[PDB]
Structure 1
Amino acid sequence: GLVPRGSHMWIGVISLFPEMFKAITEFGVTGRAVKHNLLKVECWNPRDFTFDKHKTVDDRPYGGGPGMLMMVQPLRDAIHTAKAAAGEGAKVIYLSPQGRKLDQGGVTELAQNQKLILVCGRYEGIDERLIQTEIDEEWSIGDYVLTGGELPAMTLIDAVARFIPGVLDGLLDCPHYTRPEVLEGLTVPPVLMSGHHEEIRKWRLKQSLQRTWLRRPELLEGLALTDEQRKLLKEAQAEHNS
């Protein structure tokens, strides 16, 4: 290919439903990243590692209780095959609600890895000793439970892929407006039609500060605001208080 590839990422995926990953590899910005060789996603399915007639991928938990776990042998063999394909330096990630909570800073840390292997749990998850022996890091995409680790893995791939050069402040987005000039009686703020680029930049920043303060004030606590940001935030708070 001709598209500059230097920072490309390889992501191995272990999943019982590899076809789910077409949602990222066949469409959109991520699909383009795959076609241009900026991103490669390679999947291994534990089902292909079973030897019994029925291709059994689940197993009963010690101690009983409801639920099944992923069967150790097919999952372990799939992980080992993915690790051999990756060569040296691949970090193996398991997605689960018990993992470190993902945020944009963590996305940018993960995007530093040229190789990742993402293990997608189903059922009640994977045997704890496999976490100990095969998993480098455990991450959660949020505090909620899904039917498998595939959507979390897809979410992580998409988030990290945005930080790969060529694929494409700590505050919420400012409001954005497009045509038409009047929509259900609502008008575009005149500043955005002014052509004054500095006034527009400051208005957008002030709106982002105001929205972050009103919706997610804890996000402001994590920032050391610039002098300009402190002033625009004070102005917004004064206006909000009238």
Structure 2
Amino acid sequence: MWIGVISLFPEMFKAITEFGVTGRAVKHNLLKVECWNPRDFTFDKHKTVDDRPYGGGPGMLMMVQPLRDAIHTAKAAAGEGAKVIYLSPQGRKLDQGGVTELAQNQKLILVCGRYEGIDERLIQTEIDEEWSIGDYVLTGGELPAMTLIDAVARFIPGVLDGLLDCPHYTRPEVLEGLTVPPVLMSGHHEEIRKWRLKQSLQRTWLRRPELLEGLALTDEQRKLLKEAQAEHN
């Protein structure tokens, strides 16, 4: 997979390319991430990357020429078929279904914005889609772009339902006097699977009940969920 990035802080992307799972994907030529900075496309001594809005009022926008030229250089490096994504606080909110869709692309271009955003005409002429990583305010699109890279990289071959995970335990047998649930030491696989499934259903119900609303459950899951609910009283 090839990923082009437009950012005023391209060195932030070393957090992705030099470390962990994405870092090993880069070293093994399974993932390639290339960055271009609009500041490097400026013509003036002050390397001006912002510009005033026609409307008026407060806030600046990214200057069109340096940003458009950087996007064009990423498009020329990408070649045919790259999808251009603008990371925006008001774009489509990312979820696992969204990640799965984005991961079908062999080539992506991720545009990070700063200030109040980008000119509407650049969205119409250079952007394919707009995406957000959640309903919270950040200083820019760099952390969202890196989050998107990490999520999609998991889908690349060679790099590596709907319920929260069950509790997990490892050594020691006694941690600050607290013991591991005996079923996990029993060697009874079906009892362990049913205990973990019941815990997963209970944790989903107590912490994130909305996740159960749009979820078809098996007879076993329905039976185990009712059991945990009854024991909760």
TM-score by length of 1: 0.93
Distance in 2, matches of 1:222 and 1:140, equals: 22
Distance in 2, matches of 1:23 and 1:29, equals: 11
Deviation of 1:200 (Å):
1.1
Deviation of 1:66 (Å):
2.2
Q: Which whole-Å deviations, capped at 9, do the CAs of 1:66-101 have from their partners, x for residues lacking one?
A: 221110001001111111211111110011111011
Q: Which residue of 2 aligns with 1:168?
A: 160
Distance in 1, matches of 2:156 and 2:229, equals: 37
1:110 and 2:102 correspond: yes
Deviation of 1:63 (Å):
2.4
Q: Which residue of 2 aligns with 1:5?
A: none
Q: Which residue of 1 aligns with 2:124?
A: 132
TM-score by length of 2: 0.97
Deviation of 1:47 (Å):
1.1
Structure 2 stretches lacking a partner, 5+ long: none
| Cα RMSD (Å) | 1.0
Distance in 1, matches of 2:57 and 2:16, equals: 36
Deviation of 1:174 (Å):
0.8
SS of the residue 2:2 aligns to: strand
Distance in 1, matches of 2:158 and 2:192, equals: 27
Deviation of 1:65 (Å):
2.1
Q: Which whole-Å deviations, capped at 9, do the CAs of 1:179-217 have from their partners, x for residues lacking one?
A: 111112221100111111221111111111110011111
Q: Which residue of 2 aligns with 1:79?
A: 71
Q: Number of residues paired by the alignment?
A: 233
Q: Which whole-Å deviations, capped at 9, do the CAs of 1:125-182 have from their partners, x for residues lacking one?
A: 1111111111111011001111110000000000111122221210111111111111
SS of the residue 2:13 aligns to: helix
Deviation of 1:227 (Å):
2.0
Deviation of 1:64 (Å):
2.4
Distance in 1, matches of 2:66 and 2:146, equals: 22
1:52 and 2:44 correspond: yes
Structure 1 stretches lacking a partner, 5+ long: 1-8
Deviation of 1:48 (Å):
1.3
Percent identity over paired residues: 100
Distance in 2, matches of 1:25 and 1:80, equals: 23
Q: Which residue of 2 aligns with 1:234?
A: 226
Deviation of 1:228 (Å):
1.9
Deviates more, 1:152-161 or 1:52-61: 52-61
Distance in 2, matches of 1:37 and 1:238, equals: 52
Deviates more, 1:140-149 or 1:198-207: 198-207
Distance in 2, matches of 1:204 and 1:36, equals: 35
